[PDB]
Amino acid sequence: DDWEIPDGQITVGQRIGSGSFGTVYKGKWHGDVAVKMLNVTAPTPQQLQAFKNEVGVLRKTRHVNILLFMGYSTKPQLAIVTQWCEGSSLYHHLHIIETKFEMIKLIDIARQTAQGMDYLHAKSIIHRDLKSNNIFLHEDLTVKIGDFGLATEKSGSILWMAPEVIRMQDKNPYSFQSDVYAFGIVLYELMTGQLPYSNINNRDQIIFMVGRGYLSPDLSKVRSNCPKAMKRLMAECLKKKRDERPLFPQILASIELLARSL
Numbered sequence: 296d297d298w299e300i301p302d303g304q305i306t307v308g309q310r311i312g313s314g315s316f317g318t319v320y321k322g323k324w325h326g327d328v329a330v331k332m333l334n335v336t337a338p339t340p341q342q343l344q345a346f347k348n349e350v351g352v353l354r355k356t357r358h359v360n361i362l363l364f365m366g367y368s369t370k371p372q373l374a375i376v377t378q379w380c381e382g383s384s385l386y387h388h389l390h391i392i393e394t395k396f397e398m399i400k401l402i403d404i405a406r407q408t409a410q411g412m413d414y415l416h417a418k419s420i421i422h423r424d425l426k427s428n429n430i431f432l433h434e435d436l437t438v439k440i441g442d443f444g445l446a447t448e449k450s451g452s453i454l455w456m457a458p459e460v461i462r463m464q465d466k467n468p469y470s471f472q473s474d475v476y477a478f479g480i481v482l483y484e485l486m487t488g489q490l491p492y493s494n495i496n497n498r499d500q501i502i503f504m505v506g507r508g509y510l511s512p513d514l515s516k517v518r519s520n521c522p523k524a525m526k527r528l529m530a531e532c533l534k535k536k537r538d539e540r541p542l543f544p545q546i547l548a549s550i551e552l553l554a555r556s557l
């Protein structure tokens with residue numbers, strides 16, 4: 296396969312967001328597209344390697360619930376082209392404009408996320424930065440999971456981090472279950488319409504306490520109309536001890552059960 300888009304083909308439209316590791320533009324390329332470019336002048340050996348990593352990971356994915364990769368560009372600057380996403384991220388909906396979703400819809404959002412996560416994990420891919428920000432409600436109807444983060448070098452958002460990741464275990468604390476915990480927080484987000492630890496205004500303390508398990512999401516905050524099976528699944532995903540968490544085939548199965556009888 297070869298997915299390189301020759302220079303000049305893409306019409307770089309309006310700037311969206313900029314970060315340490317790339318600037319995003321809306322664009323034209325056989326229809327609307329999103330264009331993330333990872334440098335302005337000198338491409339660093341690191342940048343060039345992380346460009347290859349990101350493309351490489353992205354092109355392993357073909358699933359409705361994951362952002363559609365469409366192509367990459369090297370001349371004149373290292374760029375990754377994906378589908379354009381119409382709408383808002385889940386973080387934006389819940390925490391900025393407070394869209395009041397119904398339970399049916401919330402559970403469905405959770406379902407579609409679990410559906411995509413399932414895929415990623417199945418494809419030997421660990422997300423490493425799941426959060427309602429990287430859950431895009433495309434067309435308000437279909438969840439697209441990507442990594443829209445610009446601060447990190449795709450080769451931190453602390454609330455979604457698992458204790459063993461927030462602590463420090465040798466080199467690789469990241470696992471499927473590290474992703475699962477993040478999903479747990481995301482479930483918490485749907486069910487409380489709120490961020491965890493909203494009543495603590497100190498970052499360091501949160502980091503420290505989550506790590507030592509002195510702090511945990513206050514689960515008694517769930518919307519009353521939320522199913523009890525959901526609350527229970529949420530707690531499973533949020534278990535402090537890493538190996539006690541369910542994997543995604545199991546999570547998915549569980550969500551689909553409570554979805555059908557409602």
Ligand SMILES: Cc1ccc(NC(=O)c2cccc(C(C)(C)C#N)c2)cc1Nc1ccc2ncn(C)c(=O)c2c1
Pocket residue numbers: 311312319329330331349352353356362375376377378379380381420421422440441442443449
């Ligand atoms: C243009 C682009 C290219 C590549 C990536 N990269 C990833 O999503 C990614 C990078 C590394 C790893 C992964 C995995 C596969 C692990 C996931 N998920 C995904 C993001 C983007 N950003 C991007 C893509 C589409 C967009 N639609 C609408 N709006 C308004 C946006 O701001 C926007 C931003």
